[PDB]
Every structure is written in structure tokens, then in C-alpha cells.
């Protein structure tokens, strides 16, 4: 659940699957990478809501990473909101969220992982293993606004 | 407003309800699975799923018997995606798969849940253009973590 991801000194990142994600610091971070705000209470509905909640804390507590997935609790995974603090990106963060994400929900027994991503993401990705509409399958969105 | 149940339809030599109560037997949904050719899954997992999602809507034929079911995992604020929509292959091509959707887009509206997803089988993707789902907006791509299919 809690573990020390690296050190570096001159602070330490700590990956959580526990979910405590203040609502507060998430709307810092989601500003940082120019998300537009929501309501808090939505926000925390959709926290509560979500199967997994894995987040990355640089202790020196500060939230600088954070995925989440919705999820069946059987077959099914989506992936939804993974951002890492502009300041630590390229530090290969990123990648490590990511894959503890995957090997959580492989480890909870679903077999199914998703994720939609933007046209700039799709390479990265793509290199940790997902694969763009595999055999024909399309991602649709009813009536979208993007 | 669109209630929990409803009646869709009325023919004879026969009712058609839609739901959205849930109250789906896995037995039921087991073998309707069956019959579209899709292979068994294990019953608690089943069970597991059904209780698992937001929303689970049914098309029964009533005289009992469970022809249709839409299901849709959420957030219950933002996202819902939209899994296992499938139709007893007796019942198909009545308009029925086209009647589910509609009023399981609607209650994830009225619900107030804005972003509605779904990954189509290509044989399928038509179907859903039909009733206003895009593929891929913007460049958006639908992935999945090494699939086996
Ligand atoms: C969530 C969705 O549905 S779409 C995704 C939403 N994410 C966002 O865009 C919000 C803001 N984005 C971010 O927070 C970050 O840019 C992230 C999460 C995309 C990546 O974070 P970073 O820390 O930059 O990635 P990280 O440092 O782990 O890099 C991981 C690897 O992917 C590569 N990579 C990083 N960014 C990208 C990119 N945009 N495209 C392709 N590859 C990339 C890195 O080079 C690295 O490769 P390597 O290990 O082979 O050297
Ligand atoms: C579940 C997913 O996320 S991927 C979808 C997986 N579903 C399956 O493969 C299960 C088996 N398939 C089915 O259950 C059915 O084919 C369904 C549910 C897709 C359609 O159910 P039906 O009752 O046959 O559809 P319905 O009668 O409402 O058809 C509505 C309209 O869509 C059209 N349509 C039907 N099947 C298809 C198709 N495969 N591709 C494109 N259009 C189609 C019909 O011709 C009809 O035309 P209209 O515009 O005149 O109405
Ligand atoms: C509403 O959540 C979703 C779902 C899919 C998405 N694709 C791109 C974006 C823009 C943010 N990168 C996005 C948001
Ligand atoms: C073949 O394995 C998978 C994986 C996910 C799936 N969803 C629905 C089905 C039935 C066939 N479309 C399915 C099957």
C-alpha cells in the first residue's frame, strides 16, 4: 500500500494505494496542469467513487501524483486523471505510478485495463504496454466536448 | 423524468419492460450470456460485477424473461462507460438494442453524469454512431493493457 518510490537529497516520493487524497491539495495540483476546477464535493464524490486511488507524496507531505480507475471490481478497469506535478515530470514518476497502478488492479484480479488518452499521451502509453484499438475496438464518447 | 420501470412495448401471439432496478438473476443473465455465444463466467464474479455497477438495466418478457441487459460502471459524478450490452438473438433486430440505449443514455443524463463512454467491437461501431457516440474525438484513443483478443 504505502512505499518509498526514491530519494534524492539537496525529499522522498512515497506511492499510496490508501486513497488519502485531500480534495483541497488535488485542485492545486489539477491547476498546476491547467485543469479546469470542479466542484469539490463532485470532485470527492468522484474519489470516493473510484476503485482505485493511488497517489504520489514527496515527504520532506506534499501530492504531486495521482491516477485513479473506476473499475467492476471483477473484469473491468478504466483509468481516469493521472497528472504528475509539472515540476517532477520527466523524472520517470510517471511511469512508476503507472506501473504499480497496473500491477495493483493485475494483483486485485482484473483482467481488463483502460484507459482513454489524449492525442500528446498515446506514446506514453503505448510504451508501458497499452494497446491503441486492438482488433478493430473503438473508444466512443456519446455527444463529446473536447 | 423517466421512471425506474417501464413498458416498452405490447404485442401478442407480451410486454416489453425496460429497468433500471437492477434486480437481475445471474442465472438468468448466465444464460442469455450463452446464448450470444459468450463464455461462462464464474457466478460470484458475476454477482460481483452486477453489484459493482452504477448502472444495470433490463429488458424482460413479461407473460419473466430476462432478452436484454445494458450495464455501466461510474464515478457517479463524471465518467460511465458502458459495458455488455447485449440482446437474446430471438429479440434482435426488433429495435430493442436501439430502445435499451436510449433510456440508458438518459438516466446516466438525468443522473447528471456528462462523460458517457463505451468500447465498440468493430462489427458493432455503426450501431453506436447511430445514437450519437463518436469514435475517437479529438484524437482520443481507447487503450487496453496487452490484450489478448
Ligand atoms: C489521463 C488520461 O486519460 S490522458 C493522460 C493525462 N495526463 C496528462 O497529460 C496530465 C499531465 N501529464 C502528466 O502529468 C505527465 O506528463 C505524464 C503523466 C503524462 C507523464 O509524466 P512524466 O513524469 O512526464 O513521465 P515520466 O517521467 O514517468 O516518463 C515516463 C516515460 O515516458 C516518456 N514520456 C513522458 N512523457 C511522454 C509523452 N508525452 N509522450 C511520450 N512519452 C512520454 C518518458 O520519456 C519516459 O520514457 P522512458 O522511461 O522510456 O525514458
Ligand atoms: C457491449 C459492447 O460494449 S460492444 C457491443 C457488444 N454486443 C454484442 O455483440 C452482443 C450481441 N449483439 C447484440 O446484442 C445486438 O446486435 C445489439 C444489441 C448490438 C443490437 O440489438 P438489436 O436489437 O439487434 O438492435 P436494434 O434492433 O435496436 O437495431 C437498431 C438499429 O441499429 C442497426 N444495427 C443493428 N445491428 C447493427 C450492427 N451490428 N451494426 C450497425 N448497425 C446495426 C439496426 O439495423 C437498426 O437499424 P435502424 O437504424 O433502422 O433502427
Ligand atoms: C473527462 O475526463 C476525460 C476523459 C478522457 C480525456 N481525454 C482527454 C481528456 C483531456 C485531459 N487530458 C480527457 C478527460
Ligand atoms: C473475449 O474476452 C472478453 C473480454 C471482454 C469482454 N466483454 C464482453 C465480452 C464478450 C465477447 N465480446 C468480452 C470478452
Known sequence: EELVLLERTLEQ??????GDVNVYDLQALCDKVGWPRRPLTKIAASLRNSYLVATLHSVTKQLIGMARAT???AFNATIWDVLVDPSYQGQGLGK???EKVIRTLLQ??????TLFADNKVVDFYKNLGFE???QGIKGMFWYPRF
Open 96 to 98: 512508476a505510478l503507472m
Open 71 to 73: 473499475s467492476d471490481h
Open 132 to 134: 491503441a484499438d486492438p
Open 108 to 113: 486485485r484480479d482484473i483482467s481488463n485495463i
Open 13 to 18: 516520493i512515497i506511492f499510496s494505494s490508501a
